[PDB]
Amino acid sequence: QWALEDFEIGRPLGKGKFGNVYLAREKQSKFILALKVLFKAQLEKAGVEHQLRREVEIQSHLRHPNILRLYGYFHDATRVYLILEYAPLGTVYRELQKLSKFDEQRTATYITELANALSYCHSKRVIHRDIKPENLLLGSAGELKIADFGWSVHAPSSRRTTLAGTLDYLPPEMIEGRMHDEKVDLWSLGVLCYEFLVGKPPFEANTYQETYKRISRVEFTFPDFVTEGARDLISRLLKHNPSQRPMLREVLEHPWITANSSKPS
Numbered sequence: 047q048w049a050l051e052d053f054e055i056g057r058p059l060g061k062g063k064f065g066n067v068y069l070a071r072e073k074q075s076k077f078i079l080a081l082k083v084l085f086k087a088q089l090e091k092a093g094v095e096h097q098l099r100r101e102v103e104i105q106s107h108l109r110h111p112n113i114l115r116l117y118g119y120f121h122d123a124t125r126v127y128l129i130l131e132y133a134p135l136g137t138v139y140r141e142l143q144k145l146s147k148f149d150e151q152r153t154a155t156y157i158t159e160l161a162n163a164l165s166y167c168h169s170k171r172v173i174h175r176d177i178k179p180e181n182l183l184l185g186s187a188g189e190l191k192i193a194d195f196g197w198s199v200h201a202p203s204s205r206r207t208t209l210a211g212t213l214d215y216l217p218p219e220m221i222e223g224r225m226h227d228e229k230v231d232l233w234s235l236g237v238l239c240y241e242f243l244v245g246k247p248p249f250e251a252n253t254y255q256e257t258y259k260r261i262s263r264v265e266f267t268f269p270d271f272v273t274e275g276a277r278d279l280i281s282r283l284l285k286h287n288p289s290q291r292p293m294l295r296e297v298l299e300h301p302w303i304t305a306n307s308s309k310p311s
């Protein structure tokens with residue numbers, strides 16, 4: 047259906063391991079969108095074709111205000127192109143670098159939006175498994191949208207593919223290559239809540255080997271400025287035993303979340 051000739055390409059929006067993402071406009075409708083470009087040679091080399099097909103299949107069928115749309119795809123013998131909803135206010139990652147830390151209202155609102163999106167995903171037994179600031183985008187009204195579904199699967203699951211970069215957002219069961227389920231996303235939600243308030247993730251270290259140790263032992267501490275409510279929520283989420291982590295309804299109804307969020311469930 048769609049082909050490259052149908053679009054005018056513009057400003058580079060960002061780069062990922064495989065993804066090279068551009069602003070683009072469809073010629074006859076003037077529709078503005080984002081084009082995620084993948085090189086076939088790199089995909090074949092890394093053996094991640096199944097990850098691409100998952101991304102397309104899972105993301106194109108989901109419909110939620112806090113989840114980024116995928117409209118379709120095409121391909122041209124060196125490249126694969128994913129047609130995405132354009133997020134005009136950028137990434138949460140960039141926003142965090144701008145401000146250093148988020149205040150409690152901003153943090154609680156983001157967490158509410160994430161939990162709503164994840165609740166929708168989990169109701170289809172879809173687990174994202176790669177929730178981190180560079181994969182959280184911002185809509186025109188500043189609302190958070192989950193993106194990058196290349197690592198997503200149906201639960202329960204093992205990990206069939208190599209862990210690439212940072213360990214910072216992954217729970218013990220996944221770093222230790224064990225069996226895992228929906229509760230992995232809830233661990234990541236705790237990591238994010240901490241990073242939003244503090245400015246860095248709670249298990250950060252200088253080496254892979256040391257980060258690994260801090261995660262498997264759940265070794266984190268709080269700076270003095272983190273309030274009691276925030277500490278309670280974060281401590282509930284960062285549990286070694288997955289079954290002990292709260293349900294998303296508990297997150298959305300937590301007193302600190304209700305006191306500080308500006309959006310509802």
Ligand SMILES: Nc1ncnc2c1ncn2[C@@H]1O[C@H](COP(=O)(O)OP(=O)(O)O)[C@@H](O)[C@H]1O
Pocket residue numbers: 059060061062063064065066067080082114130131132133134136137180181183193194196
């Ligand atoms: N729809 C979009 N709108 C605006 N920027 C985007 C969009 N999609 C991706 N980006 C930017 O490109 C980067 C990489 O996109 P992503 O889909 O995460 O690629 P990868 O799968 O390689 O991680 C993102 O971190 C973001 O900065």
Ligand SMILES: CCSc1nnc(NC(=O)OC)s1
Pocket residue numbers: 072077079117129
């Ligand atoms: C250049 C094609 S962009 C596109 N295709 N289909 C769409 N559907 C849509 O907006 O549904 C809400 S947007």
Ligand SMILES: [Mg+2]
Pocket residue numbers: 062180181194
């Ligand atoms: Mg990404």
Ligand SMILES: [Mg+2]
Pocket residue numbers: 062065194195196197
């Ligand atoms: Mg990806």
